Amino acid sequence: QVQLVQSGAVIKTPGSSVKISCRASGYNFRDYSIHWVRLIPDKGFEWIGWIKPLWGAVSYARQLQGRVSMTRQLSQDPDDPDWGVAYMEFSGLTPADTAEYFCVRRGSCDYCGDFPWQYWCQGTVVVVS
Amino acid sequence: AENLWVTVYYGVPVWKDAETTLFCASDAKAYETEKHNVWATHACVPTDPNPQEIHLENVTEEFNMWKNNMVEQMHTDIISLWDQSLKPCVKLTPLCVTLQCTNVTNNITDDMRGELKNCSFNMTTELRDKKQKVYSLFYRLDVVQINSNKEYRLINCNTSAITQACPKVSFEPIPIHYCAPAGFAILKCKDKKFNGTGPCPSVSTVQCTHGIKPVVSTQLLLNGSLAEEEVMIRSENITNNAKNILVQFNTPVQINCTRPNNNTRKSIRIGPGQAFYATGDIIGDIRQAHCNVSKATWNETLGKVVKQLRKHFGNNTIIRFANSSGGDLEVTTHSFNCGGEFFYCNTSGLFNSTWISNNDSITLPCRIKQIINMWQRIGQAMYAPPIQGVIRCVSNITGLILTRDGGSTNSTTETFRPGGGDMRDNWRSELYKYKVVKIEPLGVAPTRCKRRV
Amino acid sequence: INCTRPNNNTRKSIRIGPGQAFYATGDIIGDIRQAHCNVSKATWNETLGKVVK
Amino acid sequence: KEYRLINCNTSAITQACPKVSFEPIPIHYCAPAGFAILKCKDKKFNGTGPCPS
Amino acid sequence: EIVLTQSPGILSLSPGETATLFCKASQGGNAMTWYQKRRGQVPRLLIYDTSRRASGVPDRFVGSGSGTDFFLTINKLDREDFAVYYCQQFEFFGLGSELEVH
Amino acid sequence: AVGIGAVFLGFLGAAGSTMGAASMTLTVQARNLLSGTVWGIKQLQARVLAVERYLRDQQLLGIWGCSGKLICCTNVPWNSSWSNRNLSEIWDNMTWLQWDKEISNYTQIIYGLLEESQNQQEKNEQDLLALD
Amino acid sequence: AVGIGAVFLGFLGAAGSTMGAASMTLTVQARNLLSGTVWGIKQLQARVLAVERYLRDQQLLGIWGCSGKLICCTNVPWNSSWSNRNLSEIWDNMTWLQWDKEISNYTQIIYGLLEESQNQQEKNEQDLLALD
Ligand SMILES: *[C@@H]1O[C@H](CO)[C@@H](O[C@@H]2O[C@H](CO)[C@@H](O[C@@H]3O[C@H](CO[C@H]4O[C@H](CO)[C@@H](O)[C@H](O)[C@@H]4O)[C@@H](O)[C@H](O[C@H]4O[C@H](CO)[C@@H](O)[C@H](O)[C@@H]4O)[C@@H]3O)[C@H](O)[C@H]2NC(C)=O)[C@H](O)[C@H]1NC(C)=O
Ligand SMILES: *[C@@H]1O[C@H](CO)[C@@H](O[C@@H]2O[C@H](CO)[C@@H](O[C@@H]3O[C@H](CO[C@H]4O[C@H](CO)[C@@H](O)[C@H](O)[C@@H]4O)[C@@H](O)[C@H](O[C@H]4O[C@H](CO)[C@@H](O)[C@H](O)[C@@H]4O)[C@@H]3O)[C@H](O)[C@H]2NC(C)=O)[C@H](O)[C@H]1NC(C)=O
Ligand SMILES: *[C@@H]1O[C@H](CO)[C@@H](O[C@@H]2O[C@H](CO)[C@@H](O[C@@H]3O[C@H](CO)[C@@H](O)[C@H](O[C@H]4O[C@H](CO)[C@@H](O)[C@H](O)[C@@H]4O)[C@@H]3O)[C@H](O)[C@H]2NC(C)=O)[C@H](O)[C@H]1NC(C)=O
Ligand SMILES: *[C@@H]1O[C@H](CO)[C@@H](O[C@@H]2O[C@H](CO)[C@@H](O[C@@H]3O[C@H](CO)[C@@H](O)[C@H](O[C@H]4O[C@H](CO)[C@@H](O)[C@H](O)[C@@H]4O)[C@@H]3O)[C@H](O)[C@H]2NC(C)=O)[C@H](O)[C@H]1NC(C)=O
Ligand SMILES: *[C@@H]1O[C@H](CO)[C@@H](O[C@@H]2O[C@H](CO)[C@@H](O[C@@H]3O[C@H](CO)[C@@H](O)[C@H](O[C@H]4O[C@H](CO)[C@@H](O)[C@H](O)[C@@H]4O)[C@@H]3O)[C@H](O)[C@H]2NC(C)=O)[C@H](O)[C@H]1NC(C)=O
Ligand SMILES: *[C@@H]1O[C@H](CO)[C@@H](O[C@@H]2O[C@H](CO)[C@@H](O[C@@H]3O[C@H](CO)[C@@H](O)[C@H](O)[C@@H]3O)[C@H](O)[C@H]2NC(C)=O)[C@H](O)[C@H]1NC(C)=O
Ligand SMILES: *[C@@H]1O[C@H](CO)[C@@H](O[C@@H]2O[C@H](CO)[C@@H](O[C@@H]3O[C@H](CO)[C@@H](O)[C@H](O)[C@@H]3O)[C@H](O)[C@H]2NC(C)=O)[C@H](O)[C@H]1NC(C)=O
Ligand SMILES: *[C@@H]1O[C@H](CO)[C@@H](O[C@@H]2O[C@H](CO)[C@@H](O[C@@H]3O[C@H](CO)[C@@H](O)[C@H](O)[C@@H]3O)[C@H](O)[C@H]2NC(C)=O)[C@H](O)[C@H]1NC(C)=O
Ligand SMILES: *[C@@H]1O[C@H](CO)[C@@H](O[C@@H]2O[C@H](CO)[C@@H](O[C@@H]3O[C@H](CO)[C@@H](O)[C@H](O)[C@@H]3O)[C@H](O)[C@H]2NC(C)=O)[C@H](O)[C@H]1NC(C)=O
Ligand SMILES: *[C@@H]1O[C@H](CO)[C@@H](O[C@@H]2O[C@H](CO)[C@@H](O[C@@H]3O[C@H](CO)[C@@H](O)[C@H](O)[C@@H]3O)[C@H](O)[C@H]2NC(C)=O)[C@H](O)[C@H]1NC(C)=O
Ligand SMILES: *[C@@H]1O[C@H](CO)[C@@H](O[C@@H]2O[C@H](CO)[C@@H](O)[C@H](O)[C@H]2NC(C)=O)[C@H](O)[C@H]1NC(C)=O
Ligand SMILES: *[C@@H]1O[C@H](CO)[C@@H](O[C@@H]2O[C@H](CO)[C@@H](O)[C@H](O)[C@H]2NC(C)=O)[C@H](O)[C@H]1NC(C)=O
Ligand SMILES: *[C@@H]1O[C@H](CO)[C@@H](O[C@@H]2O[C@H](CO)[C@@H](O)[C@H](O)[C@H]2NC(C)=O)[C@H](O)[C@H]1NC(C)=O
Ligand SMILES: *[C@@H]1O[C@H](CO)[C@@H](O[C@@H]2O[C@H](CO)[C@@H](O)[C@H](O)[C@H]2NC(C)=O)[C@H](O)[C@H]1NC(C)=O
Numbered sequence A: 001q002v003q004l005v006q007s008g009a010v011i012k013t014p015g016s017s018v019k020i021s022c023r024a025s026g027y028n029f030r031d032y033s034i035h036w037v038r039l040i041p042d043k044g045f046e047w048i049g050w051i052k053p054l055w056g057a058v059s060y061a062r063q064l065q066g067r068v069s070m071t072r073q074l075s076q077d078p079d080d081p082d083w084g085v086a087y088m089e090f091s092g093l094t095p096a097d098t099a100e101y102f103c104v105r106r107g108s109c110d111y112c113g114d115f116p117w118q119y120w121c122q123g124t125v126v127v128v129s
Numbered sequence B: 001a002e003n004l005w006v007t008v009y010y011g012v013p014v015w016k017d018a019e020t021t022l023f024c025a026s027d028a029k030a031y032e033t034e035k036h037n038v039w040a041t042h043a044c045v046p047t048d049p050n051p052q053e054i055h056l057e058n059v060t061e062e063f064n065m066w067k068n069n070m071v072e073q074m075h076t077d078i079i080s081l082w083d084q085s086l087k088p089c090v091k092l093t094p095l096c097v098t099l100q101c102t103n104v105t106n107n108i109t110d111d112m113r114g115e116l117k118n119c120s121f122n123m124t125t126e127l128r129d130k131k132q133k134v135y136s137l138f139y140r141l142d143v144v145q146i147n148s149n150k151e152y153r154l155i156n157c158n159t160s161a162i163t164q165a166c167p168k169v170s171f172e173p174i175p176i177h178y179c180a181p182a183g184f185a186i187l188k189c190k191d192k193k194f195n196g197t198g199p200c201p202s203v204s205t206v207q208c209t210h211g212i213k214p215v216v217s218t219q220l221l222l223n224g225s226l227a228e229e230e231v232m233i234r235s236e237n238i239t240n241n242a243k244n245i246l247v248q249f250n251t252p253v254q255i256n257c258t259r260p261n262n263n264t265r266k267s268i269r270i271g272p273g274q275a276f277y278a279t280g281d282i283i284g285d286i287r288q289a290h291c292n293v294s295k296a297t298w299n300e301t302l303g304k305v306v307k308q309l310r311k312h313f314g315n316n317t318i319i320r321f322a323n324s325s326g327g328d329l330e331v332t333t334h335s336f337n338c339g340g341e342f343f344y345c346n347t348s349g350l351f352n353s354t355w356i357s358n359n360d361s362i363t364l365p366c367r368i369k370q371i372i373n374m375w376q377r378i379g380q381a382m383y384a385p386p387i388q389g390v391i392r393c394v395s396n397i398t399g400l401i402l403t404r405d406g407g408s409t410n411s412t413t414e415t416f417r418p419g420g421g422d423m424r425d426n427w428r429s430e431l432y433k434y435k436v437v438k439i440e441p442l443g444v445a446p447t448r449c450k451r452r453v
Numbered sequence C: 001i002n003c004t005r006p007n008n009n010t011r012k013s014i015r016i017g018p019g020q021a022f023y024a025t026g027d028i029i030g031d032i033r034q035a036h037c038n039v040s041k042a043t044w045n046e047t048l049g050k051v052v053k
Numbered sequence D: 001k002e003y004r005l006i007n008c009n010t011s012a013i014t015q016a017c018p019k020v021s022f023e024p025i026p027i028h029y030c031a032p033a034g035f036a037i038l039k040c041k042d043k044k045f046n047g048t049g050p051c052p053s
Numbered sequence E: 001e002i003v004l005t006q007s008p009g010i011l012s013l014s015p016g017e018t019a020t021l022f023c024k025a026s027q028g029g030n031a032m033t034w035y036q037k038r039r040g041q042v043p044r045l046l047i048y049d050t051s052r053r054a055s056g057v058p059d060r061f062v063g064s065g066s067g068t069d070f071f072l073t074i075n076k077l078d079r080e081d082f083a084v085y086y087c088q089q090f091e092f093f094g095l096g097s098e099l100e101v102h
Numbered sequence F, G: 001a002v003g004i005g006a007v008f009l010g011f012l013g014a015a016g017s018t019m020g021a022a023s024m025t026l027t028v029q030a031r032n033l034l035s036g037t038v039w040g041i042k043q044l045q046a047r048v049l050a051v052e053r054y055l056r057d058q059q060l061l062g063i064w065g066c067s068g069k070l071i072c073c074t075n076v077p078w079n080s081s082w083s084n085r086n087l088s089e090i091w092d093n094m095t096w097l098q099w100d101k102e103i104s105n106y107t108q109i110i111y112g113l114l115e116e117s118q119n120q121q122e123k124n125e126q127d128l129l130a131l132d
């Protein structure tokens, strides 16, 4: 089975920095993208970015550039080659960032594209004040 | 009369689409460099000269580069050949040891850092009782700090072993020919304009492909096959921004790269019959290895690709470029293997431009890693030996790999960035013209004849 | 038939050298009991009566 | 008071990998082209002799 | 940029019936995706590639449509089916719809 | 005599043309079918897969009326409910690639019809030479 | 028409029954004969052993009168000193498994008789078409 785990909730001062882990377990980590997305009240969804962990190739959205960074850490041993860690990092915090964040993985079928994300994390609520 | 009778026909020329294995074969000149010094002559029948390339009339088939097979087994086969070319070579187990290091003799400005470190340590001799003190040179990207004094260790000695390549076996590519076994055929679209998907109205079958030289490169693929007239862009779903964009342009643009530092190799013995190659003295001034391209040809080819790219996004569109966004080392820069040594060379100086709606040479600096790890396997790190003398290499830049930024929120500009990603796309730049089909004889049709008793 | 070992066990990873793992047996959280097996009485006696017959 | 391992005077020793499991799985046997496998479906057949179905 | 438009949206009905929400794209040619979000929970995938169902999906959810216009139709409404729904072409998103018990 | 005539093409050369012209050459399409350190296993399984396919085809042709004729006729009448085409158009209009999608539904039955027909004809001629 | 008739069995299905009923089906017993990292060597030698056996049988049938008839007759009279059985009983009484133990002694001679008979018939018809 596929499993994702996010971090605990957080309140931050304005103009701060926040680092969020997304831990993945249950599949070969070197073969799938990881996307980050946000959810604000009265806004609907809003896509942030995507990262491939085989070389850590990332891409960010245009209206959020210069304020975010995505890294990864693989698993290096021949015992448990599946688990992996993604790290999101967000700087230049505003009060408008009051939201909930999610890291997702797509479905694994044949006609599965890339954007129909199947598996989700349990969501981290972030309050800035 | 009206009692038409069935008639069976053996050898009706018709086929279907299928998937199977394939066949590796090269020329006879690769056997002249004897005793398997190049790879792909362990497993290579020599190709027969002038194979048939028979032409066809009316028949029209559809192709698809994106769900095409046989590229997957090519990516398997190169990895398997790479692994088969290593087990007869020596391991480097007793080298993971505490290193006493210092700076090389150089009038160093304080704010600049040394690219070379000079280390000495202990090593076993041919016997078991004697041990000796020896020294060598290393790059900064291979040693890290263990933690008065100052000492280092190798980067890979906490997760894996390390295998040295043999200095016999070379690294340059050679034209690999692919061939189908008995009972299949390989089709080929000879159309002048075919983007990469759909029907092609002038086909031709074949038994063996053209020459394919496998080179490994992350951006700006080299020594490739250029298209006929225009500059063609190809993608799977263009409005999707997850997929890469392959650009094949018409005229090749020359590129030079060189390392100028003269180098002296040195042979340390590990024990009985084990050689090891250090990097000894440096005769000359310490300069920095770099690459040159011409100015105006680069600017003109970028104008070409802007003019061709404007058709897929409307005419009144600002288009710009930017360097790589981030990630690990070998995907920001572009990376290749010249002269039996690996280069990682920064590319930010080329992708900085913007384009409105209506003699000098560019250099760029590189770096040199000695240990490598291609394909990011979990327990496989490979050392590479140094070489002798000043090194330079000339090549033809042929194609490009791009990625659109996922720009929402109402912006007319569409920036583009280079992104290496998979190794599969370099082969997909060359197998965009072949699908494999399976013969089926024994058709059956009605006509007016009847078998007598 | 049931069989069980009740002692809680903690593994531990020693490194031998470059890329070699080795697994010891670390601390023991709990009382040291003895691993054993249970079977039912009457079913066993009845099946032995069957095979005697 | 000191000890050593039991096997270190006659042999080396290989650790199993913790990846590979040990539970059995249903292995099916099959005959190649040009043979067949017979099967006695008789209810009482001790293990030797003719079987009529 | 491709903008999605959601139709009727605020829709109050009784159990046991059928219902249908509408969405319209600014650019045709692409596929469609439907997402369900319940109250205080994690969203869940219903429809990808405009007609295909995910795991754990009863087939009484049927998506359809062509070009730019896509309909999502649920027959035989249940109590757990009252939720918030989203249409999805690419990284873009629609505003949503509301299913309420009447 | 011949200044410029159509000589011959490679195998699958005629396959764009009509079936009437394509039926003139079959031997070319028939001959290019047999022949022209882990890798040896892949080559050997490729070769035995090739000869396995060819032997299956030879046996399946052998159980009908014609073993090695390469062109046969038989005693099963064409039911027009399969094809609904005129005789005049098929030999001068369509290709085999065009043909195969049209006759794709009605397969695997015609083969059994040929089997039963050859079986009954063999037992009847067996009875004929039995009274002979 | 047919409410309940004997449809067909698997291969070796009829083999308990008499030879007269078993001779109605041969194609089933004939078709299930060809097709349906050290281990690949065992599979490859199994497959080539299978095709070696089948090709030996095809050649041995080819050197007699009938290449691909699947039912033959020839010009060698049955000597009753081998079998000493009536005609009336064998086709309605015995099975092939029952038959093979009875005819097990007189083998390897009948094959040579067929060889010589086919050879002499071929050279005589050769002389016939020689004067033709
Ligand atoms: C894209 O394709 C181009 C075109 O081939 C490649 O450019 C060539 O790369 C090869 C590397 O394999 C270069 O070959 C090297 O040339 C050296 C110089 O050779 C000259 O000198 C010798 C001796 O005097 C003359 O006989 C010869 O005619 C040349 O004039 C050689 O010294 C090299 O060989 C060394 O290695 C072998 C390995 O054991 C030793 O045996 C040799 O003794 C020697 O030490 C090698 O042959 C070649 O010069 C490049 N240029 C051209 C124009 O061909 C690009 O490399 C390729 N792109 C990429 C990215 O690789
Ligand atoms: C790929 O190639 C590109 C092109 O060369 C590289 O891009 C350049 O990268 C450098 C990073 O080093 C950019 O930043 C410059 O670094 C200087 C280093 O700072 C030293 O000096 C200051 C005092 O000036 C010390 O305090 C410090 O400790 C260092 O010792 C800065 O000084 C530069 O500042 C310049 O601009 C500002 C603004 O105008 C002035 O105030 C300064 O006086 C000075 O003029 C500068 O910030 C550099 O800008 C990049 N080039 C361009 C054209 O932008 C990439 O780095 C390379 N890729 C990789 C991975 O290296
Ligand atoms: C853009 O990206 C898409 C993927 O996101 C990419 O793929 C194409 O998508 C279309 C869908 O519009 C595919 O067309 C389908 O192909 C399959 C192949 O068998 C058919 O089964 C499909 O049939 C439809 O209709 C049936 C009627 O009942 C349904 O049951 C069935 O589920 C389908 O709804 C349909 O024809 C298409 O195959 C792919 N691929 C290609 C190469 O076209 C698309 O290529 C990208 N580009 C563009 C310009 O859209
Ligand atoms: C990468 O490095 C290679 C190193 O070989 C370099 O290729 C060489 O470049 C030079 C100069 O660019 C070429 O020399 C040319 O020679 C031709 C024929 O001899 C001449 O037409 C040229 O000028 C001659 O005539 C001029 C008067 O018109 C004179 O002023 C001049 O002195 C010459 O006599 C020109 O010099 C040489 O042919 C190539 N060699 C190869 C193998 O390519 C390449 O230029 C470098 N890359 C870049 C982008 O600079
Ligand atoms: C080996 O260990 C296993 C551990 O799972 C054990 O199997 C379990 O045993 C218990 C008790 O023997 C079983 O529980 C039973 O549940 C059924 C259905 O719920 C009931 O009919 C039984 O009693 C119920 O009703 C009684 C009144 O009639 C109540 O007094 C009682 O509390 C129950 O409510 C009975 O308890 C259980 O089903 C099994 N589970 C499995 C998976 O087998 C097994 O017994 C052990 N072996 C031996 C030889 O003891
Ligand atoms: C770092 O590299 C340097 C050179 O790049 C190495 O330094 C050299 O080490 C040798 C040791 O045998 C020195 O040789 C000695 O030189 C003196 C000079 O007269 C001579 O009298 C001795 O008999 C002997 O030949 C050599 O001088 C020295 N180089 C310099 C410039 O001093 C060194 O081994 C490397 N490693 C370090 C410093 O850990
Ligand atoms: C390579 O091998 C040499 C020789 O075996 C090592 O030299 C040894 O280094 C250690 C620590 O540097 C020395 O221990 C020191 O001894 C002195 C006086 O004996 C004492 O003051 C220190 O506190 C420390 O105990 C040791 O004596 C020395 N041996 C010799 C023969 O020189 C060397 O460390 C090895 N490694 C490298 C990287 O050079
Ligand atoms: C690459 O080549 C292929 C093949 O020519 C192109 O795919 C084709 O693109 C056209 C659009 O220019 C499609 O036409 C569309 O057809 C639908 C059918 O209903 C119609 O409703 C639209 O209005 C439009 O006319 C066409 O179907 C499509 N496929 C084929 C097999 O022709 C592709 O666009 C080319 N370019 C790129 C950048 O991929
Ligand atoms: C792509 O382009 C951007 C913009 O040119 C590059 O960003 C630049 O990155 C370098 C190093 O990451 C920054 O240099 C800084 O130097 C100070 C000197 O002490 C050091 O303390 C910092 O930690 C950092 O190394 C530089 O400021 C930055 N430029 C800007 C305008 O932010 C980026 O590196 C380029 N990508 C590649 C692969 O070259
Ligand atoms: C297991 O099954 C086999 C087969 O039924 C049994 O073997 C058979 O055992 C009987 C005795 O009950 C044998 O009969 C004896 O035959 C000789 C022949 O001369 C006769 O002189 C004796 O007086 C007695 O009647 C029989 O030959 C033998 N074999 C066969 C093929 O039937 C076997 O006994 C069964 N039980 C066990 C525990 O093995
Ligand atoms: C070797 O080179 C390094 C790198 O320049 C030197 O490190 C410097 O050390 C001094 C004092 O510790 C600092 O003030 C400098 O800022 C350091 N440089 C850097 C780039 O951080 C080191 O001293 C050199 N060692 C020798 C023996 O020359
Ligand atoms: C690189 O270094 C080597 C080693 O010194 C140089 O080779 C020397 O060349 C001179 C000139 O002919 C000879 O006298 C020496 O005997 C050579 N030494 C060896 C070991 O062969 C080489 O010339 C240097 N490369 C340059 C200067 O481009
Ligand atoms: C790189 O480009 C050059 C020209 O820019 C190619 O050189 C031509 O090669 C063909 C085939 O050998 C010759 O017929 C021409 O005479 C060459 N020169 C020109 C000006 O066309 C070269 O083949 C390309 N590839 C490599 C590997 O160097
Ligand atoms: C066996 O020992 C482990 C290790 O202590 C126990 O796991 C702990 O369980 C408690 C209760 O949830 C947690 O607070 C600890 O964090 C757990 N530790 C680890 C390392 O996971 C386990 O419960 C024990 N088994 C029993 C008591 O049956």
Ligand SMILES: *[C@@H]1O[C@H](CO)[C@@H](O)[C@H](O)[C@H]1NC(C)=O
Pocket (backbone or CB within 6 Å): A076, B144, B155, B158, B159
């Ligand atoms: C090995 O050392 C590097 C040095 O930074 C470190 O990042 C890595 O986590 C280490 N791995 C292990 C398994 O200790």
Ligand SMILES: *[C@@H]1O[C@H](CO)[C@@H](O)[C@H](O)[C@H]1NC(C)=O
Pocket (backbone or CB within 6 Å): B299, B300, B353
């Ligand atoms: C490329 O060349 C054209 C014409 O020489 C010039 O107008 C343009 O500015 C050049 N490109 C850049 C980026 O300067």
Ligand SMILES: *[C@@H]1O[C@H](CO)[C@@H](O)[C@H](O)[C@H]1NC(C)=O
Pocket (backbone or CB within 6 Å): B348, B349, B350, B352, B353
């Ligand atoms: C942007 O483009 C031009 C030419 O490359 C120049 O002003 C500048 O060096 C470029 N930016 C960077 C960061 O190199």
Ligand SMILES: *[C@@H]1O[C@H](CO)[C@@H](O)[C@H](O)[C@H]1NC(C)=O
Pocket (backbone or CB within 6 Å): D006, D009, D010
């Ligand atoms: C190894 O040690 C055991 C310990 O009792 C002993 O019985 C055995 O004989 C020894 N074998 C050898 C070869 O020494």
